[PDB]
Amino acid sequence: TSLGRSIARSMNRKFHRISLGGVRDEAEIRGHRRTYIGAMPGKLIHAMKQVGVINPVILLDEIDKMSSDWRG
Amino acid sequence: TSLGRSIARSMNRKFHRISLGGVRDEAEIRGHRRTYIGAMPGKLIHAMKQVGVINPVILLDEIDKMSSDWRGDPASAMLEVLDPEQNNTFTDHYLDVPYDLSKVFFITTANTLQTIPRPLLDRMEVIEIPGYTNMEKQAIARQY
Amino acid sequence: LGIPRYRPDKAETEPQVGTAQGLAWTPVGGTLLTIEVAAVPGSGKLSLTGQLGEVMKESAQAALTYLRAHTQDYGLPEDFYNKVDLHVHVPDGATPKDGPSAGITMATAIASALSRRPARMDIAMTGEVSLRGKVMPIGGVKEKLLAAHQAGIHKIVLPKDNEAQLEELPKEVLEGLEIKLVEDVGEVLEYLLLPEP
Amino acid sequence: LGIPRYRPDKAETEPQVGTAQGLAWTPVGGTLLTIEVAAVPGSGKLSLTGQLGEVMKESAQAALTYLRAHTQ
Ligand SMILES: Nc1ncnc2c1ncn2[C@@H]1O[C@H](COP(=O)(O)OP(=O)(O)OP(O)(O)=S)[C@@H](O)[C@H]1O
Incomplete structure (x- = not known):
């Protein structure tokens, strides 16, 4: 992870990371079609x-x- | 898939590829009933x-x-895909009206002819693509 | 006009192992349907195509039951239920009429699929089947006979207890079509099969 | 009226060598529920047809356990 942070520092563009492990569906990688309050993307x-x-x-x-x- | 893109360049239609290897569920090939949040077709x-x-x-x-x-089997389902006159009678579980895939031109991929499901051995043509030699590989390398 | 609207008569009706010409009841005027069966050795699993109600699955199961009851009389495999998957094709979704669409026709279809003998044609058969070899009567043989006359098929067998139907229909259809009466599915094992086994 | 629609006073019903008639009740009123059991050779497993609930299978094994004490 700090390898990637270093590579982005050398890149002089901002590093980011998202712990995408443990996710059981496409509904929070693509989100879902809006139908109520609390509608959320991926x-x-x-x-x-x-x-x-x-x-x-x-x-x-x-x-x-x-x-x-x-x-x- | 280079053969498929060659054919699709010949016909100037749209080309797409989907996986079918490792599919265990018919309901992966078919849809599902509307019994859960975000019910899905095939x-x-x-x-x-x-x-x-x-x-x-x-x-x-x-x-x-x-x-x-x-x-x-899902063999009977892609057998439904096979005949275009049977294409307008799909099994479906999210949708219900059988779609018109009669005009969708069909091209297929199977690495082993022997493990293709035996209800589908009818209306397959075995056109075996063999391996490649030293110079044939060199020539296609150096060319493309 | 151009193309004929249907396939021309008795060129679609060909003697095959796979095909099966059975009478159908359709509320806009009944038809006949081309059932196609394919039995090469497998494991015993039944598969369905075409937006089917499950009742046709169980009627095919009952057909398998009758073939399990009387195996050796017609060269059927001794133990096929552990080695033959059955896969049928139906051109339409579901009959709104209750019961099997044509139960004994499917029984003959998968029996001809198991014995690998082509079906006889010029005989369009239909009926509803039970578990003791009793072909219980079918209502609405009227539009079935109308469709068979429209199919040009004049030989139409019926279940035994529909014999009183043959007096309540008017004569003009009854004379144009030949009717046999059957009670056993083993009886129509001899009436749609090209050889006697 | 035409042909008698329904079978008359039952002195000879359908041939019943593997089955028997049966009495029951619907919401709309009772019918003669002639249970069809077909004894086919197999692997001795229990194979239900008839869009059946489970109450059927414990009643089934009640009968099976009755005649498994009463084979001979
Ligand atoms: N004899 C050949 N066999 C395979 N590819 C070839 C051949 N000659 C040229 N190619 C080139 O190789 C590419 C396509 O082959 P590959 O990329 O190795 O396989 P693929 O098409 O990507 O995947 P497959 O074969 O569908 S699993 C294209 O750029 C072709 O022009």
Whole structure:
């Protein structure tokens, strides 16, 4: 992780990270279609929302730790 | 898939590829009932949902690697995909009206001919792509 | 006009192992439907195609039950239920009419799929099946016979207890079509199969 | 009226060598529920058809356990 932070420092663009391991569905990687209060996008959109630029240095955390069974 | 893109460049249609290897559930191939939040159609239906025309050239992946540990096969489902006159009678569980995939041109992928499901051995053509030599590999390397 | 609206008569009706020409009841005027069966050795699993109600699954199961009751009479495999998956194709979704669509026709279809003999044609058969070899009567043989006459198929067998139907229909359809009466599914094992086993 | 729609006063019903008639009650009124049991060779497992609940199978094993004390 600090390897990626260093690579972004050398890049002089801001590092980011999102612990995407342990997620059981597509409903918070793509979000869901809006139908009520509390409608929310995917975690990636949260990530690049708290990164105020359109070209960050994004580091994925646990792709191999994704889970699947329901909700896409 | 270079063959598939070659065919789709010949027809100037849209090309797409979807996985079928390692599929265990028929309800992965089919849809699901509307009994949960965000109920979903099949892989094929959403694959058509991302294409914008009803006659693209669509590739599969690893159709010799389905499985099903319960009664019935998804072999009968892609057999429903096979005949275009049977294409307007899909099994469906999220949707219900059988879609018109008659014009969707079908191209398929199976690495092993022998492990393709045996209810689908009818209306397959075995066109075996063999290995490659030293110079054939060198020539296609140096060329493309 | 151009193309004929339907397939031309008795060129669609061909003697095959796979195909099966059975009468259907449709509320806009009944039709006949092409059932296709494919039995090469498997494990015993039944599979369905075409937005089907599950009742046709159980009617195919009952057909398997009758084939398990009387195996050796027609060259059927001695133990096929552990080694033959059955997969049928139905062109339409579900009959709104209750019961099996054509139960004994499907029984003959998968029996011909198991014995690998082509079905006889010029005989369109339908009925509803039970677990003791009793083909219980079917209501609405009227539109079935209308469709068979429209199919040009004049030989139409019926369940035994629909024999009183043959007096309450008016004559003009009854003369145009030949009718046999059957009670056993083993009886129609000899009436749609090209050889006697 | 035409053909008698329903079977008359029952002196000879359908041939019943594997089955028997049965009395019951619906909301709309009772019918003669001739249970159809078909004894096919197999693996001695219990194979239900008829869109059945579980109450059927414990009643079934009640009968099975009755005649498993009463085989011969
Ligand atoms: N004889 C050949 N076999 C395979 N690829 C070839 C051949 N000659 C040229 N190619 C080139 O190789 C690429 C396609 O082959 P690959 O990329 O190795 O396999 P692929 O098409 O990506 O994946 P597959 O084969 O569908 S699993 C294209 O750029 C082709 O132009």
